[PDB]
Design a protein around this ligand. Structure first.
Ligand SMILES: N#Cc1cc2c(cc1[N+](=O)[O-])=NC(=O)C(=O)N=2
Ligand SMILES: N#Cc1cc2c(cc1[N+](=O)[O-])=NC(=O)C(=O)N=2
Ligand SMILES: [Zn+2]
Ligand SMILES: [Zn+2]
Ligand SMILES: [Zn+2]
Lengths: 258, 258
């Protein structure tokens, strides 16, 4: 009867509310996906519980065992009914789960510490002094893994073997790394996070260049789930009513600090 | 056996080859959606025949009779198997046909003749001198019809009563009307077409402001088609391999004239 929603702690999508302690259930959390979850549930008429994904991951597939982890895993194995999170629509995922039409558009981007003499991907590919990486389990890593485009393959060859690892477990960790590495680390990540962070104290990073690709976050359900159809039309109604844009403005730019 | 593809003659998606008279079948046509149709069909393993939608329209539903016209109609009524065209993914269409994930991202935008003193939608809504309108059957008109946002509703109230009519039958007619009206008509259309026209002679138009919304074009199938799933995976594969961005560059910018 109550729908189990899997999501991930990633700012400004899902964050613990300051007084989160004196709060219970769904009320402990706030952010873009908390608001979206409430709207989706209202329009589709279900009650829900927000659960934070147990391994802290979006999801990737073990090369050997072929087992999915992260939010994708929770869906595939039936531990959650829906993922309301910034979950990137990719081919490998669509093969095992269903996605709504995108609620947010995005692309891979480059984050630098301000003053770093690095303006595009080509710039990173052609030098060494400045290290760079990506999230360890996710869509951006796979993009570089499977790229034939020459600048991106060069970056891949450098990235995979780099020592110590240029890969980070969580986004927060990559952001933290840029900020503390004195311009000797650049982070490849989704444009959404990049834009959010550039407007957060201490205002010491910047997005550079355009996006390397174009894609979308969708709301995900297990393959063949009845919820899929209503959720998809629900996302469309919200986009067309301007609510998704209102929410983006609310969580990125209205409380912008720079 | 051969899949019937409905499409629309809209540059640079589908155009008659200069010497199409001396050609047959699919070889009469060229463009972004011609190149994409060939790839979708090869990746899904079907033969196909390109056909141009009989009424020249994307698709809207008659208020009185509730009948769908344009490419949406051809799918609803069984006259085509698939629409490979720049068909906007919207709630009202999704209610009657299926769409793949977006093969292109876009939003409604403002086209002006160079020098017109307009920067934004708010600017248009606060005057009178400069008339403005949209395509008469399609998703941009419906956006304004159904928008509860003050600026856009104010625009709709003006457009829906303006005389002579500010609506246009075809995109081409709208572009021509900007170009000939000496700064006294601005046209609201999809950003893809705005961007295309800005790079064609006589180089007298430009896109101003940001997009008013964010949406996608999808490949459409009748509900229940067997092709939906394969077509979807094909679009995601082609995006991830970089083909969609290469195709956009070929048809918009590689041959740009400005
Ligand atoms: N926001 C966000 C993000 C959302 C993500 C992500 C990386 C980021 N990021 O840190 O930039 N990788 C993923 O595979 C994903 O499904 N969703
Ligand atoms: N390009 C293009 C276009 C594609 C469109 C369109 C208008 C334009 N336009 O002229 O901007 N209206 C639609 O309802 C649609 O499904 N697809
Ligand atoms: Zn605590
Ligand atoms: Zn609502
Ligand atoms: Zn001819």
């Amino acid at each position: 009867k109550t729908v189990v929603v899997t999501t991930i702690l990633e700012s400004p999508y899902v964050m613990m509310k300051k007084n989160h302690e004196m709060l219970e259930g769904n009320e402990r959390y706030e952010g873009y996906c908390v608001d979206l979850a409430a709207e989706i549930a209202k329009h589709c008429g279900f009650k829900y519980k927000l659960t934070i994904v147990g391994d802290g991951k979006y999801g990737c597939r073990d090369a050997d065992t072929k087992i999915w982890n992260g939010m994708v895993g929770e869906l595939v194995y039936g531990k959650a009914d829906i993922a309301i999170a910034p979950l990137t629509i990719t081919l490998v995922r669509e093969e095992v789960i269903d996605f709504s039409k995108p609620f947010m558009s995005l692309g891979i981007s480059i984050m630098i510490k301000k003053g770093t003499p690095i303006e595009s991907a080509e710039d990173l590919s052609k030098q060494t002094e400045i290290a760079y990486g990506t999230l360890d389990c996710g869509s951006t890593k796979e993009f570089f893994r499977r790229s034939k485009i020459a600048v991106f393959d060069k970056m891949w060859t450098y990235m995979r073997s780099a020592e110590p690892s240029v890969f980070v477990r969580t986004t927060a960790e990559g952001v933290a790394r840029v900020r503390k590495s004195k311009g000797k680390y650049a982070y490849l990540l989704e444009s959404t996070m990049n834009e959010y962070i550039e407007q957060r104290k201490p205002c010491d990073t910047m997005k550079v260049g355009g996006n390397l690709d174009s894609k979308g976050y969708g709301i995900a359900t297990p393959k063949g789930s009845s919820l899929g159809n209503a959720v998809n039309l629900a996302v469309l109604k919200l986009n067309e009513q301007g609510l998704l844009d209102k929410l983006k403005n609310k969580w990125w730019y209205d409380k912008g600090e720079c």
